[PDB]
Design a protein around this ligand. Structure first.
Ligand SMILES: CS(=O)(=O)NCCc1ccccc1
Ligand SMILES: CS(=O)(=O)NCCc1ccccc1
Length: 282
């Protein structure tokens, strides 16, 4: 079926939970043996969210190459994304090592450091120009260059230096700051505006490594971002845009990381975002 009328049909019939459970039943199951090794326990935030072995990002290190991160490679859309958990106190150096090694231009953050009165990720970037951060375990330096605070999101320019080679690179930090503590946003307008700002920066384009996108677990809000982006790109590329099937795209993405889209409300929100976005594109 088309999307917008399938949407009204699920709303009128109140069957979002049944649609979402079908997706959960049909989703891929692949091994995640490296994630579950005892030496990696303090490298995982949640025991039930792990990268599959076949798609995990490897750190270029011989001691321990493990990070909780996955490469989502969308062949028809010609887009790739790295989805990862919010960094932990003992993985902030690994996180920036990955950004460096994968040649990423942008980092997309969809959570606040504290939500619901608890810490959802480490404070992993510097807040003042004159107070830079040094990650001694991976030999990197990170400096805040500029910050632009808007009503729904903040963009930061960061300088990442590989202290071993003295090479430097500019990294863009795109921080969506207004996702509610509970539920999903009422309108997708600010989320779509944010997606378009990431696109306009070059951070999603083939002349760079894959964008790094995270929330707390790296599957819910993060899944919504890449699902909406890929569906909109396919609608622009194909002769028949009504042939794009959001459930099929989501199942394809779940071949590369488990659990993408965590609730039926997130699924409904993803439909809403793609529907509204397809009208603005033209
Ligand atoms: C000392 S520093 O500020 O230059 N770098 C420390 C990296 C780190 C950041 C946040 C939480 C844990 C560790
Ligand atoms: C404003 S500036 O002169 O300090 N900017 C230089 C460009 C640059 C930005 C961020 C990271 C690396 C390079």
């Amino acid at each position: 079926m088309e999307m917008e009328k399938e949407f009204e049909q699920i709303d009128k019939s109140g069957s979002w939970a049944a649609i979402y459970q079908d997706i959960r039943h049909e989703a891929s199951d692949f091994p995640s043996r490296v994630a579950k090794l005892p030496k990696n326990k303090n490298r995982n935030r949640y025991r039930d969210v792990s990268p599959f072995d076949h798609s995990r990002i490897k750190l270029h290190q011989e001691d321990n190459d493990y990070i909780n991160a996955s490469l989502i490679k969308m062949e028809e859309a010609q887009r790739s994304y790295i989805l990862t958990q919010g960094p932990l106190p003992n993985t902030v150096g690994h996180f920036w090592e990955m950004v460096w090694e994968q040649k990423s231009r942008g980092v997309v953050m969809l959570n606040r450091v504290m939500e619901k009165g608890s810490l959802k990720c480490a404070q992993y970037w510097p807040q003042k120009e004159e107070k830079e951060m040094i990650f001694e375990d991976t030999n990197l330096k990170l400096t805040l260059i500029s910050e632009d605070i808007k009503s729904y999101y903040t963009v930061r320019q960061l300088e990442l230096e590989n202290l071993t080679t003295q090479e430097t690179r500019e990294i863009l930090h795109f921080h969506y700051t207004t996702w509610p503590d509970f539920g999903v946003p009422e309108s997708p307008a600010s989320f779509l505006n944010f997606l378009f700002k990431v696109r306009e920066s070059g951070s999603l384009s083939p002349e760079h490594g894959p964008v790094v996108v995270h929330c707390s677990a790296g599957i819910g809000r993060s899944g919504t971002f890449c699902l909406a982006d890929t569906c909109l790109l396919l609608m622009d590329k194909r002769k028949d845009p009504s042939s794009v099937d959001i459930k099929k795209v989501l199942l394809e993405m779940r071949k590369f990381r488990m659990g993408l889209i965590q609730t039926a409300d997130q699924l409904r929100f993803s439909y809403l975002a793609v529907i509204e976005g397809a009208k603005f594109i033209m």
